[PDB]
Amino acid sequence: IVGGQEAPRSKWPWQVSLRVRDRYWMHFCGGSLIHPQWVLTAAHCVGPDVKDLATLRVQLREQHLYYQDQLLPVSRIIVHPQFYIIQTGADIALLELEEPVNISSRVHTVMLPPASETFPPGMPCWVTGWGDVDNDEPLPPPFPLKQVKVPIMENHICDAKYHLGAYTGDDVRIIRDDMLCAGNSQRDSCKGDSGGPLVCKVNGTWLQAGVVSWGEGCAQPNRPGIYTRVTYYLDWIHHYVP
Amino acid sequence: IVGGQEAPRSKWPWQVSLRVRDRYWMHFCGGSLIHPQWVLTAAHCVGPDVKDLATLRVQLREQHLYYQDQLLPVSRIIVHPQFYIIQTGADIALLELEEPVNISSRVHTVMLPPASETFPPGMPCWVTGWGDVDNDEPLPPPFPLKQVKVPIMENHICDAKYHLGAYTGDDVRIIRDDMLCAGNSQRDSCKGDSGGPLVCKVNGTWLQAGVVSWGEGCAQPNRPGIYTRVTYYLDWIHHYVPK
Amino acid sequence: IVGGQEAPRSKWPWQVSLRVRDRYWMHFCGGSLIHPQWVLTAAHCVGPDVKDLATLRVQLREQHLYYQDQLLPVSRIIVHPQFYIIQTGADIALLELEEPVNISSRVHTVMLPPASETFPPGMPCWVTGWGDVDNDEPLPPPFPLKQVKVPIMENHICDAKYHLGAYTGDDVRIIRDDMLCAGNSQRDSCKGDSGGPLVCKVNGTWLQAGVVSWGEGCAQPNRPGIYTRVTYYLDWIHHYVP
Amino acid sequence: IVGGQEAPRSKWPWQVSLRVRDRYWMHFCGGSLIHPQWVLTAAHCVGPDVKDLATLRVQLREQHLYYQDQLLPVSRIIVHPQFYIIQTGADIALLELEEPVNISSRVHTVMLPPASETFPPGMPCWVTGWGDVDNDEPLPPPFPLKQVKVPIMENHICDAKYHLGAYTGDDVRIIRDDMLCAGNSQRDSCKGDSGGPLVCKVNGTWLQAGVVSWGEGCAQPNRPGIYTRVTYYLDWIHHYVPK
Ligand SMILES: *[C@@H]1O[C@H](CO)[C@@H](O[C@@H]2O[C@H](CO)[C@@H](O)[C@H](O)[C@H]2NC(C)=O)[C@H](O[C@@H]2O[C@@H](C)[C@@H](O)[C@@H](O)[C@@H]2O)[C@H]1NC(C)=O
Ligand SMILES: *[C@@H]1O[C@H](CO)[C@@H](O[C@@H]2O[C@H](CO)[C@@H](O)[C@H](O)[C@H]2NC(C)=O)[C@H](O[C@@H]2O[C@@H](C)[C@@H](O)[C@@H](O)[C@@H]2O)[C@H]1NC(C)=O
């Protein structure tokens, strides 16, 4: 997270950390609890190539990464079939836990948005995670969960920004309809935040609008963070999650 | 170049090295002289974002990088407008030199193929460059230009290979019509070879079949190197480079 | 610490971590509380060149580095004047804290040995710290304090070991009288353990026999870790520490 | 070499490069040809632990490192027995080549100094090598041999400088009698120059005054480069090297 602050303990109870087996269970992506037994995350975190499930673990919200670990094995990994690379979309995946987790005030699910919510510019939204605090600048120990408020940029405006300073033709769409843009040169997600949530407050309720997907650098001018637009994949999600 | 050998001085007179201004003019990509004043390379070597030409130089055929450099400035860069990322194709670009270079047996152009050449499996082809000799293994000094013969794999066969062991649905095309696959787990190009040429001996003549574009690792089982298919963009090329 | 285990919460209440001002207060060396207001460490951890005290802090016994830090400023650093490089000895230094710490069962001093104790081979001894778990392998988060039992090797036997396979003449002493050897190819200290304690259980009492000083690699065959022999410097220590 | 320039091809014909086997024959220290079959270098480059001679090679003077290699195997490595670590001195070693090399204008020996030469401050001396051009800044390809004029600092003055800003007692000698100090905050040797020569011109003749040994940083204030004083080891050298 670039430009943010450490999260209050009572915030983002749905945040999760994905760990890969490497000398220790190392954090590599975020995710969100969307059902007591299901984690929502980015396809690019667990694909396109099929991985051995023995090498992955999920960690539920912790104020400080690695300090109070209670690792949870995954029973199944479901990656959207249209996914191959982030720039072409469908960057979304589901992790079914071996067992449903206990639901409390400190650890619980985030609500998915109704199909009609477009999250237009002006919406108050935050992205959270334990990623780098700037380009090539890792979050220092004790690794607090961070948050940052990021402004939403309408898709067409964002698509135009991506063409600014690039050879790509205007008629060539960079930002797709299954994507959403948020952030600016001072507020954005960074390496390690991928797969985590972008939540917006709508009439007093938190709804997950996006999944951290890709970008052209952390908090880089004219290159807002790109997220997978959750509403676009509700039908697919509902095919697996109760 | 993975699994190859140092190229003989008289081979590949069209090979070029692209340099970026660093603590020295550091090699970062290959290219090929397709006309006395035009270098063909990959778009990803110079885009999709526009870069300051002041930070780029072209070096013509040399046996060892950096030893006897005679760097050339680039007048202009033309990147195919359909290019954004390597996996969606159109990974091709043209660099116009300030003046036409002097053609000799030592340095000269490579012929482009006629639109009908498909370069099917079995065709003898070589990829050349100063790229890594293996994953995370940079070419050692004195940096000789290397070459390696790479086996061609038909597009659909290759597309099926890329779906092996992946979540990606079969209805999702990974290898596109403007791409070509060559290489195996023993012979392939690697980091730093991008933009360079894949050339095939067709009935006694050397034709450039591809431009090193991408892949999923260097000489990795069931993931051959992917090249931009030159015949696909002949008309685009001929829009800028004189016939 | 190479080849050890995480230390139990109630063990080594004298262990301390030395921190240098970086993107965070990063651990760089160990030390031991030998008096409520004095920390014993290795000179090479703080010299031979004089450094700005503002860039240094002491952290008392904690189970996991960085998690619950309560950093302490150092009022004064006293480095043995005979120190220049580890291989010529006198690798010992004292840090005076600004205030005497609160002694408890969880945090208290370690006893220094009487001058006559030689700590001969066979003596049960442990080295503790947050150093690498192997050559070029840093301690993984959450950075637990580790411990390992290390075999003592008599000085001359050790000095002969250090000449094995070397051009160095036998008349050249490598292991000095103010040094002590401990460790083998399975158990030893490693980068980041320097300055910490080697403590031995002598007839029911824990005595600090050495200070981690140097060696030729971590847990390397025929090259035991070298420690500054505490008894050798008792008078020097007692010139400053009550 | 910090603060220097590329050496003219005609200078330092005695400079050699020591190479260790690692993916390629990689440079790791300098040396000087003091006899057609003997190379003088630093003990720390080839010790204190005995190394397999098959992993070492010597390269005679090359204007550009790695470009025209003609590697020479070593027949024997003789390290001073008093050597253990650089700060305690005796940092000197001899390499006997399998065969004597051809002597020419471009490649030949450097003269050792007479026992009486102390090389006081003011003497014009240069250190040469292919080492880093600054702290953590490697020599960029094509790796030219560099040189730099370094001022000599009298031993006592140098020893006092080393105690400046340090806890070490004044009565504790840091700079020993078998050492010699040269350099300042703008001119010095650096990582990779170790083992190479410090040569001074005395009445129109080049004499090797020192072997690059150690120091605290490349061109660091009050920490001049430290060299093994060759005159101190003439008897030892003469025990192995003829004439
Ligand atoms: C999830 O919440 C459950 C309900 O509180 C926990 O089970 C309960 O564990 C208590 C002690 O942690 C125990 O007093 C309760 O009797 C027991 N109740 C039931 C219905 O199981 C559960 O803790 C786990 O399960 C218990 C039985 C032990 O095996 C513990 O070691 C487990 O932590 C909570 N943790 C989960 C399910 O992840
Ligand atoms: C040392 O000097 C000799 C005289 O220059 C070298 O021999 C000469 O090598 C020439 C090719 O390098 C060759 O055309 C000359 O006929 C030959 N002359 C003589 C007197 O032999 C010698 O080169 C080595 O030995 C010769 C015989 C060949 O085997 C070469 O390949 C060798 O390099 C020089 N030695 C070295 C190690 O350079």
What is the DSSP secondary structure assignment for residue A235, as one 8-state letter? H
Angstroms from D66 CA to nearest CA on chain B: 5
If phi over 0 gives left and psi between -120 and 50 gives alpha, with beta otherwise, what is residue C138? beta
Q: Does domain D13-109+232-243 have CATH number 3.40.50.9100?
A: no
Closest by Cα among D87, D78, D84 to D178: D87
Tokens representing residue C26 in the block: 């990063």
- Look at residue C159 and give its three-state secondary structure: helix
- Where do the H-state alpha helices sit in chain B? 155-163, 234-237
- Within an 8 Å CB–CB cutoff, is residue A136 touching chain C? no
* 8 A C-beta contact, residue C49 and residue D223: no
Experimental determination technique: X-ray
Whether C83 contacts D168, CB under 8 Å? yes
Which residues on D lie below 8 Å from C43 (Cβ)? 167
Q: Nearest C-alpha of chain D: how many angstroms from B24?
A: 6
Looking at the DSSP bridge assignments, the partners of residue A225 are A182
Q: How far is A162 from chain B (nearest CA, A)?
A: 9
Tokens of C40: 């014993």
Q: Is D202 on the interface with C (CB under 8 A)?
A: no
Angle (CA) D206-D211-D212 rounded to 5° is 120
**Count of beta carbons in the 10 Å neighbourhood of residue D38:** 22
Token output for D190? 């650096």
- Cβ-based contacts of D49 with chain C (< 8 Å): 165-167
Interchain contact C/D (3 or more Cβ pairs less than 8 Å) = yes
CB-based contacts of A160-163 (< 8 A; 24+ apart in sequence) = A161/A222, A161/A223, A161/A224, A162/A216, A162/A222, A162/A223
How far, in Å, is the centroid of ligand 2 from the Cα of D33? 20
Q: How many Cα atoms occupy the beta-carbon half-sphere of B34 within 13 Å?
A: 32
- Partner residue facing D140 (CB), from B24, B67, B140: B24
Residues C173-176: contacts with CB within 8 Å, 24+ apart?
C174/C87, C174/D84, C175/C226, C176/C88, C176/C89
The structure tokens listed for B24 are 């020295």
CA-to-CA distance for D216 and C71, rounded, in angstroms?
A: 31
List subunits contacting chain C, requiring 3 or more Cβ pairs under 8 Å.
A, D
The beta strand positions in A60-123, using DSSP E, are 74-79, 93-97
d(CA D17, CA D26): 9
Which among B23, B67, B140 is the nearest to D67, CB-wise? B67
Query: What is the C-alpha separation between B200 and B112, in angstroms, rounded?
Result: 10
Q: Which of C212, D182, D144, D18 is nearest to B66 (CA)?
A: D144
Cα–Cα distance, C87 to D162 (Å, whole number)? 18
Residues 6+ apart with CB under 8 A from D37: D96, D97, D99, D100, D101
B21 in contact with D, Cβ within 8 Å: no
Q: Region of C230 please: left (phi>0), alpha (psi -120 to 50) or beta.
A: alpha
CATH superfamily of C13-109+232-242: Trypsin-like serine proteases (2.40.10.10)
Q: What does the domain layout of chain D look like in residue ranges?
A: 1-12+110-231, 13-109+232-243
How many CB atoms lie under 10 A from the CB of residue A146?
22
- Kindly report the CATH number that applies to the domain delimited by C1-12+110-231: 2.40.10.10
Q: Which two tokens stand for residue B156?
A: 């659909």
By C-alpha distance, the chain C residue nearest A144 is: C67
Which two three-digit tokens encode residue D53? 């001679």
B194 catalytically annotated: yes
Q: How far apart are CA D109 and CA D111, in angstroms?
A: 7
A105 CB near a chain B CB, below 8 Å? no
Helix (H, G, I), strand (E, B) or coil at D63: coil
In this complex, is the C-beta atom of B23 within 8 Å of any C-beta atom belonging to chain D? yes
Give the 3-state secondary structure of A106-139.
CCCCCECCCCCCCCCCCCCEEEEECCCCECCECC
Nearest Cα neighbor of D178 from D209, D219, D222 is D209
- d(CA A62, ligand 1 centre) in Å: 19
Backbone phi, then psi, for D222, in 5-degree steps? 55, 20
Two tokens, residue A63: 């104020």
Q: Taking CB atoms and an 8 Å cutoff, what residues of chain C touch D82? A: 169, 172
Alpha-carbon span B123 to B23, nearest angstrom: 41
Beta bridge partners of D76: D96
| Ligand number, closest to the Cα atom of D104 | 2
CB A214, CB A86: distance < 8 Å: yes
Residue C114 CB-density burial (10 A; 0-12 exposed, 13-18 middle, 19+ buried)? exposed
Do residues C2 and C189 lie in contact, with contact meaning Cβ atoms separated by under 8 Å? yes
Cross-chain Cβ contact C141/A140 below 8 Å: no
- Residues in D closer than 8 angstroms to B134, CB to CB, are none
Alpha helices (H) along A80-200: 155-163
Task: Report yes or no: B79 at the A interface, CB cutoff 8 Å.
Answer: yes
Chain B contact present for A47, CB below 8 A: yes
Length of chain D as a residue count: 243
Of A23, A140, A143, the CB nearest to C140: A23
Active site residue D194: yes
Catalytic-role residue among D91, D178, D188, D193:
D91
Q: How far is the CA of A67 from the centre of ligand 1 (A)?
A: 21
Q: D89-125: buried (b, 16+ CB within 10 Å) or exposed (e) per residue?
A: bbbbbbbbbeeebeeeeebebbebbeeeeebeeebeb
Asked if the domains C1-12+110-231 and C13-109+232-242 are classified in one and the same CATH topology, the answer is yes
CA dist D158 and D10 (Å) reads 33
Dihedral angle computed from the Cα positions of residues C100, C102, C104 and C106, in that order, rounded to the nearest 10 degrees: -90
Q: CA–CA separation, A92 vs A34, rounded Å?
A: 13
CA of A9 to the centre of ligand 1 (A): 23
Active site residue C163: no
Q: Report yes or no: B183 and B219 within 8 Å, Cβ to Cβ.
A: yes
Distance C30 CA to ligand 2 centre (A): 61
CB-based touch A/D (3+ pairs, under 8 A) = no
Chain B interface mutation, best of D25, D67, D135, highest count of B Cβ atoms under 10 Å: D67
Q: Do A141 and C143 touch (CB under 8 A)?
A: yes
